[PDB]
Scaffold this active site. Structure first.
Site, PDB file in Angstrom:
ATOM      1  CG  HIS F 202      -2.071   0.943   1.120  1.00  7.46           C
ATOM      2  ND1 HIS F 202      -2.134   2.104   1.859  1.00  7.46           N
ATOM      3  CD2 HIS F 202      -3.203   0.905   0.381  1.00  7.46           C
ATOM      4  CE1 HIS F 202      -3.253   2.744   1.573  1.00  7.46           C
ATOM      5  NE2 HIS F 202      -3.920   2.037   0.680  1.00  7.46           N
ATOM      6  CB  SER F 206       1.280  -2.781  -8.517  1.00  5.90           C
ATOM      7  OG  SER F 206       0.600  -3.541  -7.544  1.00  5.90           O
ATOM      8  CE  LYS F 228      -6.469  -8.020 -17.037  1.00  6.37           C
ATOM      9  NZ  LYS F 228      -5.374  -7.097 -17.423  1.00  6.37           N
ATOM     10  CG  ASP F 229      -8.726  -9.664  -9.455  1.00  7.25           C
ATOM     11  OD1 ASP F 229      -7.718 -10.210  -9.945  1.00  7.25           O
ATOM     12  OD2 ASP F 229      -8.658  -8.699  -8.665  1.00  7.25           O
ATOM     13  CD  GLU F 272       2.490 -35.012  -2.857  1.00 10.29           C
ATOM     14  OE1 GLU F 272       2.345 -36.245  -2.761  1.00 10.29           O
ATOM     15  OE2 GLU F 272       1.765 -34.301  -3.582  1.00 10.29           O
TER      16      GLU F 272
HETATM   17  C1  HEM Z   1       0.252 -16.491   0.533  1.00 11.01           C
HETATM   18  C2  HEM Z   1       1.159 -15.827  -0.193  1.00 11.01           C
HETATM   19  C3  HEM Z   1       1.018 -14.464  -0.931  1.00 11.01           C
HETATM   20  C4  HEM Z   1      -0.027 -13.620  -1.105  1.00 11.01           C
HETATM   21  C5  HEM Z   1      -1.494 -13.728  -0.617  1.00 11.01           C
HETATM   22  C6  HEM Z   1       0.435 -12.493  -1.888  1.00 11.01           C
HETATM   23  C7  HEM Z   1      -0.312 -11.402  -2.288  1.00 11.01           C
HETATM   24  C8  HEM Z   1       0.097 -10.383  -3.130  1.00 11.01           C
HETATM   25  C9  HEM Z   1      -0.759  -9.437  -3.810  1.00 11.01           C
HETATM   26  C10 HEM Z   1      -2.303  -9.405  -3.702  1.00 11.01           C
HETATM   27  C11 HEM Z   1       0.016  -8.617  -4.532  1.00 11.01           C
HETATM   28  C12 HEM Z   1      -0.460  -7.444  -5.424  1.00 11.01           C
HETATM   29  C13 HEM Z   1      -1.015  -7.900  -6.774  1.00 11.01           C
HETATM   30  C14 HEM Z   1       0.017  -8.615  -7.608  1.00 11.01           C
HETATM   31  O1  HEM Z   1       1.048  -7.995  -7.968  1.00 11.01           O
HETATM   32  O2  HEM Z   1      -0.199  -9.805  -7.935  1.00 11.01           O
HETATM   33  C15 HEM Z   1       1.397  -8.998  -4.330  1.00 11.01           C
HETATM   34  C16 HEM Z   1       2.514  -8.402  -4.891  1.00 11.01           C
HETATM   35  C17 HEM Z   1       3.822  -8.829  -4.745  1.00 11.01           C
HETATM   36  N1  HEM Z   1       4.228  -9.977  -4.095  1.00 11.01           N
HETATM   37 FE1  HEM Z   1       2.992 -11.341  -3.108  1.00 11.01          FE
HETATM   38  N2  HEM Z   1       1.766 -12.691  -2.163  1.00 11.01           N
HETATM   39  C18 HEM Z   1       2.160 -13.879  -1.599  1.00 11.01           C
HETATM   40  C19 HEM Z   1       3.431 -14.415  -1.665  1.00 11.01           C
HETATM   41  C20 HEM Z   1       4.556 -13.815  -2.197  1.00 11.01           C
HETATM   42  C21 HEM Z   1       5.856 -14.422  -2.387  1.00 11.01           C
HETATM   43  C22 HEM Z   1       6.133 -15.897  -2.008  1.00 11.01           C
HETATM   44  C23 HEM Z   1       6.674 -13.501  -2.948  1.00 11.01           C
HETATM   45  C24 HEM Z   1       8.173 -13.551  -3.365  1.00 11.01           C
HETATM   46  C25 HEM Z   1       9.125 -14.368  -2.909  1.00 11.01           C
HETATM   47  C26 HEM Z   1       5.908 -12.282  -3.103  1.00 11.01           C
HETATM   48  C27 HEM Z   1       6.367 -11.087  -3.625  1.00 11.01           C
HETATM   49  C28 HEM Z   1       5.601 -10.068  -4.162  1.00 11.01           C
HETATM   50  C29 HEM Z   1       6.069  -8.907  -4.890  1.00 11.01           C
HETATM   51  C30 HEM Z   1       7.542  -8.578  -5.215  1.00 11.01           C
HETATM   52  C31 HEM Z   1       5.010  -8.171  -5.239  1.00 11.01           C
HETATM   53  C32 HEM Z   1       5.043  -6.847  -6.036  1.00 11.01           C
HETATM   54  C33 HEM Z   1       4.814  -7.139  -7.513  1.00 11.01           C
HETATM   55  C34 HEM Z   1       4.731  -5.862  -8.307  1.00 11.01           C
HETATM   56  O3  HEM Z   1       4.430  -4.802  -7.717  1.00 11.01           O
HETATM   57  O4  HEM Z   1       4.974  -5.892  -9.533  1.00 11.01           O
HETATM   58  N3  HEM Z   1       4.632 -12.515  -2.645  1.00 11.01           N
HETATM   59  N4  HEM Z   1       1.400 -10.082  -3.475  1.00 11.01           N
HETATM   60  C1  LIG Z   2      -2.005  -4.118  -5.696  1.00  8.49           C
HETATM   61  O1  LIG Z   2      -3.244  -3.820  -5.087  1.00  8.49           O
HETATM   62  C2  LIG Z   2      -4.036  -4.871  -4.531  1.00  8.49           C
HETATM   63  C3  LIG Z   2      -4.697  -5.794  -5.348  1.00  8.49           C
HETATM   64  O2  LIG Z   2      -4.595  -5.745  -6.744  1.00  8.49           O
HETATM   65  C4  LIG Z   2      -5.497  -6.787  -4.802  1.00  8.49           C
HETATM   66  C5  LIG Z   2      -6.181  -7.747  -5.794  1.00  8.49           C
HETATM   67  C6  LIG Z   2      -5.638  -6.889  -3.410  1.00  8.49           C
HETATM   68  C7  LIG Z   2      -6.523  -7.980  -2.732  1.00  8.49           C
HETATM   69  C8  LIG Z   2      -5.882  -9.379  -2.691  1.00  8.49           C
HETATM   70  C9  LIG Z   2      -5.770 -10.107  -1.566  1.00  8.49           C
HETATM   71  C10 LIG Z   2      -5.106 -11.486  -1.681  1.00  8.49           C
HETATM   72  C11 LIG Z   2      -6.274  -9.550  -0.202  1.00  8.49           C
HETATM   73  C12 LIG Z   2      -7.205 -10.558   0.570  1.00  8.49           C
HETATM   74  C13 LIG Z   2      -6.378 -11.383   1.614  1.00  8.49           C
HETATM   75  C14 LIG Z   2      -6.731 -12.676   1.924  1.00  8.49           C
HETATM   76  C15 LIG Z   2      -7.955 -13.331   1.265  1.00  8.49           C
HETATM   77  C16 LIG Z   2      -5.881 -13.475   2.946  1.00  8.49           C
HETATM   78  C17 LIG Z   2      -6.800 -14.282   3.935  1.00  8.49           C
HETATM   79  C18 LIG Z   2      -6.677 -13.653   5.338  1.00  8.49           C
HETATM   80  C19 LIG Z   2      -6.940 -14.374   6.455  1.00  8.49           C
HETATM   81  C20 LIG Z   2      -6.808 -13.703   7.820  1.00  8.49           C
HETATM   82  C21 LIG Z   2      -7.370 -15.864   6.361  1.00  8.49           C
HETATM   83  C22 LIG Z   2      -8.469 -16.187   7.455  1.00  8.49           C
HETATM   84  C23 LIG Z   2      -9.838 -16.319   6.764  1.00  8.49           C
HETATM   85  C24 LIG Z   2     -10.765 -17.232   7.162  1.00  8.49           C
HETATM   86  C25 LIG Z   2     -12.098 -17.293   6.414  1.00  8.49           C
HETATM   87  C26 LIG Z   2     -10.480 -18.206   8.353  1.00  8.49           C
HETATM   88  C27 LIG Z   2     -11.721 -18.348   9.283  1.00  8.49           C
HETATM   89  C28 LIG Z   2     -12.450 -19.704   9.040  1.00  8.49           C
HETATM   90  C29 LIG Z   2     -13.687 -19.919   9.500  1.00  8.49           C
HETATM   91  C30 LIG Z   2     -14.428 -18.823  10.291  1.00  8.49           C
HETATM   92  C31 LIG Z   2     -14.381 -21.264   9.234  1.00  8.49           C
HETATM   93  C32 LIG Z   2     -14.545 -22.081  10.537  1.00  8.49           C
HETATM   94  C33 LIG Z   2     -16.009 -22.004  11.061  1.00  8.49           C
HETATM   95  C34 LIG Z   2     -16.667 -23.105  11.458  1.00  8.49           C
HETATM   96  C35 LIG Z   2     -18.122 -23.002  11.977  1.00  8.49           C
HETATM   97  C36 LIG Z   2     -15.994 -24.484  11.397  1.00  8.49           C
HETATM   98  C37 LIG Z   2      -4.986  -5.964  -2.598  1.00  8.49           C
HETATM   99  O3  LIG Z   2      -5.121  -6.045  -1.204  1.00  8.49           O
HETATM  100  C38 LIG Z   2      -4.195  -4.951  -3.152  1.00  8.49           C
HETATM  101  O4  LIG Z   2      -3.524  -4.049  -2.290  1.00  8.49           O
HETATM  102  C39 LIG Z   2      -4.070  -2.771  -2.086  1.00  8.49           C
HETATM  103  C1  LIG Z   3       6.851 -36.077   5.766  1.00  8.71           C
HETATM  104  O1  LIG Z   3       7.376 -36.186   4.499  1.00  8.71           O
HETATM  105  C2  LIG Z   3       7.201 -35.126   3.709  1.00  8.71           C
HETATM  106  C3  LIG Z   3       7.498 -35.134   2.409  1.00  8.71           C
HETATM  107  C4  LIG Z   3       6.708 -34.267   1.540  1.00  8.71           C
HETATM  108  O2  LIG Z   3       6.833 -34.219   0.370  1.00  8.71           O
HETATM  109  O3  LIG Z   3       5.883 -33.459   2.164  1.00  8.71           O
HETATM  110  C5  LIG Z   3       5.006 -32.647   1.347  1.00  8.71           C
HETATM  111  C6  LIG Z   3       8.651 -35.932   1.888  1.00  8.71           C
HETATM  112  C7  LIG Z   3       8.466 -37.213   1.379  1.00  8.71           C
HETATM  113  C8  LIG Z   3       9.528 -37.965   0.944  1.00  8.71           C
HETATM  114  C9  LIG Z   3      10.799 -37.443   0.979  1.00  8.71           C
HETATM  115  C10 LIG Z   3      11.014 -36.192   1.467  1.00  8.71           C
HETATM  116  C11 LIG Z   3       9.950 -35.431   1.903  1.00  8.71           C
HETATM  117  O4  LIG Z   3      10.199 -34.147   2.396  1.00  8.71           O
HETATM  118  C12 LIG Z   3      10.948 -33.107   1.946  1.00  8.71           C
HETATM  119  C13 LIG Z   3      11.204 -32.004   2.732  1.00  8.71           C
HETATM  120  C14 LIG Z   3      11.981 -31.016   2.148  1.00  8.71           C
HETATM  121  O5  LIG Z   3      12.241 -29.871   2.846  1.00  8.71           O
HETATM  122  C15 LIG Z   3      12.999 -28.759   2.494  1.00  8.71           C
HETATM  123  C16 LIG Z   3      12.705 -27.996   1.380  1.00  8.71           C
HETATM  124  C17 LIG Z   3      13.459 -26.884   1.067  1.00  8.71           C
HETATM  125  C18 LIG Z   3      14.529 -26.513   1.850  1.00  8.71           C
HETATM  126  C19 LIG Z   3      14.839 -27.260   2.961  1.00  8.71           C
HETATM  127  C20 LIG Z   3      14.066 -28.384   3.295  1.00  8.71           C
HETATM  128  C21 LIG Z   3      14.369 -29.169   4.447  1.00  8.71           C
HETATM  129  N1  LIG Z   3      14.568 -29.794   5.374  1.00  8.71           N
HETATM  130  N2  LIG Z   3      12.458 -31.115   0.932  1.00  8.71           N
HETATM  131  C22 LIG Z   3      12.179 -32.238   0.289  1.00  8.71           C
HETATM  132  N3  LIG Z   3      11.426 -33.236   0.739  1.00  8.71           N
END
Ligand code: HEM
Ligand SMILES: COc1c(O)c(C)c(C/C=C(/C)CC/C=C(\C)CC/C=C(/C)CC/C=C(/C)CC/C=C(\C)CCC=C(C)C)c(O)c1OC
Ligand SMILES: CO/C=C(/C(=O)OC)c1ccccc1Oc1cc(Oc2ccccc2C#N)ncn1
Ligand SMILES: CCCCCCCCCCC(=O)OC[C@H](COP(=O)(O)OC[C@H](O)COP(=O)(O)OC[C@@H](COC(=O)CC)OC(=O)CCC)OC(=O)CCCCCCCC
Ligand SMILES: CCCCCCCCCCC(=O)OC[C@H](COP(=O)(O)OC[C@H](O)COP(=O)(O)OC[C@@H](COC(=O)CC)OC(=O)CCC)OC(=O)CCCCCCCC
Ligand SMILES: CCCCCCCCCCCCCCCCCC(=O)OC[C@H](COP(=O)(O)OCCN)OC(=O)CCCCCCCCCCCCC
Ligand SMILES: CCCCCCCCCCCCCCCCCC(=O)OC[C@H](COP(=O)(O)OCCN)OC(=O)CCCCCCCCCCCCC
Ligand code: HEM
Ligand code: HEM
Ligand code: HEM
Ligand SMILES: COc1c(O)c(C)c(C/C=C(\C)CC/C=C(\C)CC/C=C(\C)CC/C=C(\C)CC/C=C(\C)CCC=C(C)C)c(O)c1OC
Ligand SMILES: CCCCCCCCCCCCCCCCCC(=O)O[C@H](COC(=O)CCCCCC)COP(=O)(O)OCCN
Ligand SMILES: CCCCCCCCCCCCCCCCCC(=O)O[C@H](COC(=O)CCCCCC)COP(=O)(O)OCCN
Ligand SMILES: CO/C=C(/C(=O)OC)c1ccccc1Oc1cc(Oc2ccccc2C#N)ncn1
Lengths: 93, 62, 54, 385, 126, 385, 126
Positions: F202, F206, F228-229, F272
């Site tokens: 924020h 981007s 678009k999403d 995996e």
């Molecule tokens: C659960 C994991 C993640 C979520 C929910 C998430 C979410 C987001 C969102 C919504 C954006 C803005 C829209 C977009 O550019 O697509 C963004 C941008 C970005 N994310 Fe993630 N992200 C995750 C993991 C990661 C990881 C693993 C990396 C890198 C190692 C990363 C690096 C970045 C970067 C560099 C940007 C900026 C891209 C740009 O501005 O061009 N994020 N992320």
């Molecule tokens: C570049 O600009 C952008 C942009 O382009 C976009 C798309 C987004 C939006 C994209 C996102 C990914 C934001 C939304 C984030 C999430 C969806 C992450 C989820 C967050 C959590 C805290 C996960 C927890 C959620 C739950 C639903 C868990 C609770 C579960 C329940 C209540 C079920 C259990 C109940 C029973 C009765 C068993 C931006 O925020 C943004 O920045 C301004």
């Molecule tokens: C419990 O076994 C888990 C496994 C799995 O794939 O989980 C999703 C697994 C099965 C067979 C052999 C190995 C397995 O686990 C793993 C775990 C692993 O972990 C890492 C990945 C990246 C960097 C470091 C590690 C570590 N430690 N990297 C590769 N295989």
């Protein structure tokens, strides 16, 4: 980001009170003061009036509820004894 | 009255200021608190961590 | 002066409160255990085993 | 500027616990909110370490807790800090809410802050109910039987909400397994509500015990209220340590050390002490559907207080009639907890019905009438006419 | 919550009655002395909650010599409260100084807001 | 103003997904971040409903999952959406990180945003490892045996980290019970890192596929990028539904339907598919201590990219040499995954050692040399001297 | 990351050598035509990343008639990119128009920042 809504508190320099003029304040460093000058002149007279000018708002409701609970506990004890057996069939109707 | 006149602060002031004694006693009490807080936080983490070692029924089948 | 040799140099004011707390643990645990066992003498298992030797 | 104000993550820390302007005259009652944050961390951390050794099957649940007490290294410390820590959590929360009633903290502009707090109180009650079921003692089984049977009196949907809550025909093995999984989750929802609670507080700040504006004299949080917070943190930990090590079963029931038996009813079914006043309100209504509605209305009636307080002054400091009836309400709450631990006998049945009426009449009758009278007495004692 | 127009309507009805002003007025004098705000150096109009648009209008229109004196009384009451003391007895507010200085500015702003609300939700007839 | 800008909780919603200014020229690669938010919700919600029926004892864990597949109403839908949903989570995350490498999103002023993302990637790998153990199939037992034995080669502390991780002398009943409790917790830590990830985004906004400033032409988020999403959300759900209902065991191993036996070793121990390239890097170092250090260095080497890129232009759009070596790095990653599923045989041993060198030489040798040459070619192709 | 003072030092050494300017200069002309920024209507100095203090200084000192023309080329390139097209061939940048207009302002700001850094961390001798 966008600006926020209107509140009733600001921050340092723009806190949001009235304008002040004519007030002077003075203070002395804590390093130049006497260490721990309270247990006396505060347990003498200060920590007695601070609650005994307030004790009557607490102990009149406390005495009402303690009298009510103690009276009901002695009546339940009478009803389940030998002497209160005849009243017990009357009030469970 | 005049703002150059400072009000009476005499019932809290020390009879001798002596800047190397007032600083020394305040830093003894702050230093003793950080000493006991670090020893208390260390045993706390070791109580939680050692609960993940092997239980008494697992060690009996060794 | 004993402020500047004990609490000024805060490379070891963080340090001495972290090293004085190490030797503090063993002296404190030895003193309490000795007091706790002397208060309960004649009741522990080591006082029992010394004359259930038979 | 300094790095604590320019960094994106440290400026949130700096504006909340370092540089935030506090009123200079708040007393030790304003320290209860930070003790509640410490209690939530203690309950979460002792919860994870016990969950590494726990089994939630109905044949294994009671013996798993006995396995923690006997075989786990320092396992009795983890359980006793967890069980006694839940009672300390409710005691600090009761004093925190009673501070808000006394000083008028619910009033505008802090209505959103008060409404989020009522949601937190509901989720904490549901959390402690689910953790008590996971012991599967004799009080665990029959307390869950009584509460879940209340929902079958709801019209047209009641007999199907209960069997959806049981997973079967009674309290059984699918009930305990789903109650442990819900017990893991709800403390994380509580932690998210606490963050929303602190955002609304940052907008307006805190009130003060005089009831008037604090914008004229502020001091920063760091090294004044940080060190005032340390006094109540160490006193809290000392009293909690005296219960954990020297009297660990005083705040519990000895029937919970008997394993759960669905064929033997205990002689008395009693909740924990912090749920006893709501248990006595439920037993005072003879109809079963109106009793469960009145039980949930006792929490939701806290939301009417911003509308029934008619005073032009915030707080109880300069009001002698509002001071008297506040302490009537406090000792009425203690009496309702004592009635909830007694048998259904004469004269405790009528005493609980009068005390239930006094609870609801405080919010809806006494507060709007007394605060209207105190508005007029302030006027005619000054105006020459 | 209750408006000052409603408080003045009830209060002026009691003060004109010769039988009601013999009963309630001795009770109101004991109520104010038991409240204790004068021992901290405050007048009653210092105690009115100000976080609403009517009170912000009335505080803007106050003359500046009275606004400086109101700010000193509030600051002195906060400092006395944190020391858990009372003021010296020669610095207490007297009853002939506890006058409603802010009340005419409040009643004027309330009447203007009522007239605006009546003209904004209004009927006509031919 | 409008209520969506004045309310304390709705202004956070309005400044993030309603009124936030986006560059007008971003393409469909910028939609992967919002798909990752949908995947995390799907994994959490199917996780809670399965946990109501799961037992974590080592004698009961395999039969509990078979009980979910057979006896729970729609229980096979919950498991298959959960297991296949984890593979879709890793595929979208790989494409999201590869978009950042190509367009230079790691560069200043977005270094904090890139560093928080690397922490998220580490926590996701640890989450999927712990959930695979909870099945207690034959691949679950021996995969946990291989990975946990790596930590005993650490000097002076190694033989006591492993038995503290086992709770005993091997992979046994205390290992599975503590791995299920950790598996519940880490997705909630991931959700808190995602909130810190969105706060840093924020601040600067981007980037765009041209690499230059976007401050001259912005359009708001609502009804342009919301719709678009929706195109990529429905395409994602359609392909996921084709795997869940029509081919649910294609992305798994058939040895995981045999219960765990500590006396019978399988003929091949394979992870995996999304962990296969890191498995081949580990098997290419003959010394056991240097192999586990190189395995963890393959993730931590992502942090050196803001310092080894020497170009004065952000992104790969106008660079023909950086385009060529980017796709060399992509197909090298696919080859390392294929080597990790083979036996230790000639010539796969030498092929894995060369491909391991090419992985680390991209970040430390190829990127600073090629980007220095492209700086000079842009200069001398224009300057008349 | 690599400074423009370092790029100009390497590049002017090649252009003065008669044997190195016969090898590298034909390769650099093929590299720019394969880059394709001129088909979107851009010059190379439009592509320089600007989120740093040296580039913000040089963009402030640019004359305003060149600053208006730079803003139009950037806006036109964003609109062409989202339509997935190229410009018409009579609107492409020619090679005699692809001049380094921003380079003398960048090199002047870099030399002033280097002289300030040398005077702030400095030795003396008697
Ligand atoms: C659960 C994991 C993640 C979520 C929910 C998430 C979410 C987001 C969102 C919504 C954006 C803005 C829209 C977009 O550019 O697509 C963004 C941008 C970005 N994310 Fe993630 N992200 C995750 C993991 C990661 C990881 C693993 C990396 C890198 C190692 C990363 C690096 C970045 C970067 C560099 C940007 C900026 C891209 C740009 O501005 O061009 N994020 N992320
Ligand atoms: C570049 O600009 C952008 C942009 O382009 C976009 C798309 C987004 C939006 C994209 C996102 C990914 C934001 C939304 C984030 C999430 C969806 C992450 C989820 C967050 C959590 C805290 C996960 C927890 C959620 C739950 C639903 C868990 C609770 C579960 C329940 C209540 C079920 C259990 C109940 C029973 C009765 C068993 C931006 O925020 C943004 O920045 C301004
Ligand atoms: C419990 O076994 C888990 C496994 C799995 O794939 O989980 C999703 C697994 C099965 C067979 C052999 C190995 C397995 O686990 C793993 C775990 C692993 O972990 C890492 C990945 C990246 C960097 C470091 C590690 C570590 N430690 N990297 C590769 N295989
Ligand atoms: C349950 C487990 C939690 C444990 C911790 C919770 C603590 C809850 C206590 C209730 C509370 O928070 O309010 C306290 C309030 C006094 O508020 P105050 O600011 O006006 O007093 C400042 C003082 O003058 C200077 O206090 P000072 O700062 O100078 O010294 C500190 C004092 C101890 O202070 C504390 O521990 C505060 C709890 O040290 C000494 O006594 C010196 C001798 C050893 O007291 C009162 O208003 C009335 C007194 C009785 C209240 C009891 C009601 C409980 C239901
Ligand atoms: C686990 C799997 C989950 C799957 C869930 C969905 C994930 C999709 C992943 C694929 C992907 O990321 O696609 C991104 C890539 C964008 O890269 P790019 O810059 O080259 O192309 C700009 C944009 O596409 C133009 O697409 P265009 O804009 O021309 O489409 C026309 C229309 C949208 O049409 C559609 O809805 C069809 C989907 O929009 C309009 O212009 C009309 C408006 C009036 O798309 C492309 O077109 C490039 C093709 C290469 C794809 C190969 C993928 C390798 C892994
Ligand atoms: C649905 C949920 C309902 C919640 C209801 C909660 C009921 C639980 C009972 C909690 C008791 C807390 C009562 C006190 C609340 C704190 C607020 C307060 O009353 O102010 C402190 C009061 C004022 O003192 P001052 O006049 O000196 O300060 C004025 C400001 N300048 O100074 C005092 O007078 C303090 C005196 C406190 C005595 C109270 C005794 C309470 C006994 C309860 C015992 C319960 C266990 C058996
Ligand atoms: C810890 C370390 C983690 C390492 C992470 C690396 C993960 C690699 C795993 C595969 C990721 C897939 C790579 C996808 C490429 C994304 C790059 C991108 O965002 O766009 C680049 C390119 C842009 O093309 P333009 O639209 O700009 O062309 C216009 C004319 N100039 O768009 C294109 O040209 C698209 C061309 C299609 C690419 C085909 C790639 C094939 C991938 C095979 C996957 C095999 C899986 C079994
Ligand atoms: C606000 C947070 C919490 C509250 C108020 C709470 C409350 C309780 C209560 C009252 C009990 C019954 C204790 C007894 O009388 O023996 C209990 C049991 C239990 N709770 Fe919690 N709990 C909380 C958080 C957690 C968390 C987050 C976990 C797990 C990750 C957890 C795991 C357990 C376990 C395993 C038991 C059974 C063992 C025992 O009886 O002590 N708790 N909880
Ligand atoms: C886990 C639970 C809670 C936490 C961590 C918490 C935390 C806090 C904190 C730190 C403060 C500021 C300092 C203070 O005034 O003590 C505060 C203020 C406040 N809280 Fe809570 N609270 C919790 C529950 C509640 C509940 C249950 C209510 C009411 C039903 C509530 C209502 C309020 C109010 C009205 C204030 C403002 C008080 C004032 O400004 O005078 N909170 N809270
Ligand atoms: C980011 C989130 C998550 C990821 C990546 C993930 C991943 C996995 C994986 C790969 C498996 C093995 C599946 C198989 O091959 O059969 C698994 C199993 C399991 N997970 Fe998760 N999980 C996540 C969240 C959760 C949560 C939050 C819970 C519980 C509240 C949970 C509960 C379970 C259960 C009970 C199993 C065993 C049943 C089964 O095999 O499907 N998961 N998880
Ligand atoms: C008015 O001015 C004030 C003010 O007066 C106060 C008091 C505060 C005080 C602030 C607080 C009290 C903070 C509130 C407390 C919380 C939000 C706590 C939230 C709880 C959590 C984050 C729980 C998380 C716990 C864990 C993740 C522990 C997990 C256990 C693990 C990882 C075990 C380790 C595993 C292995 C295998 C070793 C203010 O912020 C403030 O400014 C507005
Ligand atoms: C879900 C609730 C979320 C609540 C958020 C509360 C905030 C919690 C943060 C607690 C304090 C954390 C201290 C961060 C240290 C300073 C930040 C920093 O170093 O940023 C950067 C370096 O980037 C990083 O490596 C980030 C480290 C990841 C931190 C993950 C814990 C410092 O460099 P920079 O100059 O960019 O800082 C200015 C930013 N405006
Ligand atoms: C840091 C990450 C965590 C932050 C998450 C932010 C998103 C939270 C959820 C947003 C959904 C919006 C909720 C409804 C918004 C309307 C609230 C409202 O009307 O404000 C109050 C009503 O009070 C309430 O009852 C709030 C209940 C909150 C329930 C949330 C569980 C009245 O509105 P008000 O006039 O005060 O608006 C000005 C605010 N400064
Ligand atoms: C599983 O049994 C839980 C009990 C407990 O005390 O948990 C901490 C319990 C034991 C015996 C009898 C009843 C018990 O539970 C309860 C539950 C309860 O819940 C409510 C509290 C306030 C408002 C509504 C409800 C409900 N339902 N109110 C009173 N007792």
């Amino acid at each position: 980001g966008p600006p926020s809504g209107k509140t009733y508190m600001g921050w340092w320099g723009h806190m949001g009170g009235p304008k002040q003029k004519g007030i002077t304040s003075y203070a002395v460093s804590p390093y130049a003061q006497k260490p721990l000058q309270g247990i006396f002149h505060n347990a003498v007279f200060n920590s007695f009036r601070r609650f005994k000018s307030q004790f009557l708002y607490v102990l009149i409701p406390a005495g009402i509820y303690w009298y009510w609970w103690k009276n009901g506990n002695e009546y339940n004890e009478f009803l389940y004894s030998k002497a209160g057996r005849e009243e017990l069939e009357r009030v469970n109707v | 009255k005049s703002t150059y006149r400072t009000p009476n602060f005499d019932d809290v002031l020390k009879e001798n200021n002596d800047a190397d004694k007032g600083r020394s006693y305040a830093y003894f009490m702050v230093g003793a608190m950080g000493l006991l807080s670090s020893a208390g936080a260390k045993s706390t983490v070791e109580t939680f961590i050692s609960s993940m070692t092997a239980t008494a029924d697992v060690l009996a089948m060794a | 002066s004993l402020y500047k040799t004990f609490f000024k140099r805060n490379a070891v004011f963080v340090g001495t409160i972290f090293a004085g707390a190490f030797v503090f643990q063993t002296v404190f645990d030895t003193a309490i255990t000795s007091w706790y066992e002397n208060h309960n003498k004649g009741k522990l298992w080591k006082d029992v085993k010394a004359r259930i030797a038979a | 500027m300094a790095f604590r104000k320019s960094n994106v993550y440290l400026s949130l820390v700096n504006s909340y616990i370092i540089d935030s302007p506090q009123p200079s005259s708040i007393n030790y009652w304003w320290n209860m909110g930070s003790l509640l944050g410490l209690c939530l961390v203690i309950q979460i951390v002792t919860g994870i370490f016990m969950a590494m050794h726990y089994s939630s099957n109905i044949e294994l649940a009671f013996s798993s807790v006995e396995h923690i007490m006997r075989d786990v290294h320092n396992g009795y410390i983890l359980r006793y800090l967890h069980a006694n820590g839940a009672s300390f959590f409710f005691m600090v929360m009761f004093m925190h809410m009673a501070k808000g009633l006394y000083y008028g903290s619910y009033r505008s502009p802090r209505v959103t802050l008060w409404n989020v707090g009522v949601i937190i109180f509901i989720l904490t009650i549901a959390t402690a109910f689910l953790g008590y079921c996971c012991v599967y003692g004799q009080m665990s089984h029959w307390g869950a039987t009584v509460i879940t049977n209340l929902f079958s009196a709801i019209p047209f949907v009641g007999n199907d909400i209960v069997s959806w809550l049981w997973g079967g025909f009674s309290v059984s093995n699918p009930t305990i397994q789903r109650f442990f999984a819900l017990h893991y989750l709800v403390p994380f929802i509580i932690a998210a509500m606490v963050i929303m609670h602190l955002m609304a507080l940052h907008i307006h700040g805190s009130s003060n015990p005089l009831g008037i504006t604090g914008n004229l004299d502020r001091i920063p949080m760091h090294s004044y209220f940080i060190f005032k917070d340390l006094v109540t943190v160490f006193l809290f930990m000392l009293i909690l340590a005296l219960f954990v090590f020297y009297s660990p079963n005083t705040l519990g029931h000895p029937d919970n050390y008997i394993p759960g038996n669905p064929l033997v009813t205990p002689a008395s079914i009693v909740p924990e002490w912090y749920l006893l006043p709501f248990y006595a309100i439920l037993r005072s209504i003879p109809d079963k559907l109106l009793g469960v509605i009145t039980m949930f209305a006792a929490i939701l009636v806290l939301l009417v207080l911003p509308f029934t307080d008619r005073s032009v002054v915030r707080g109880n400091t300069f009001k002698v009639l509002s001071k008297f009836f506040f302490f009537i309400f406090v000792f009425n709450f203690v009496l309702l907890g004592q009635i909830g631990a007694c048998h259904v006998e004469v004269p405790y049945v009528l005493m609980g019905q009068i005390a239930t009426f006094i609870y609801f009449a405080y919010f809806l009758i006494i507060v709007p009438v007394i605060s209207t009278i105190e508005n007029v007495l302030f006027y005619i004692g000054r105006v020459n006419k | 919550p209750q408006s000052f127009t409603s408080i003045a309507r009830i209060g002026d009805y009691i003060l004109k009655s010769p039988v009601l002003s013999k009963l309630c007025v001795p009770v109101a004098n004991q109520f104010i002395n038991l409240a204790g705000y004068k021992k901290l150096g405050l007048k009653f109009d210092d105690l009115i909650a100000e976080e609403n648009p009517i009170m912000q209008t009335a505080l803007r229109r106050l003359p500046e010599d009275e606004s400086y004196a109101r700010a000193y009384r509030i600051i002195r009451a906060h400092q006395t409260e944190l020391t858990h003391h009372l003021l010296p007895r020669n610095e207490w507010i007297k009853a002939q100084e506890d006058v409603p200085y802010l009340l005419p500015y409040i009643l004027e702003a309330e009447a203007a807001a009522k007239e605006k609300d009546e003209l904004d939700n209004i009927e006509v007839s031919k």
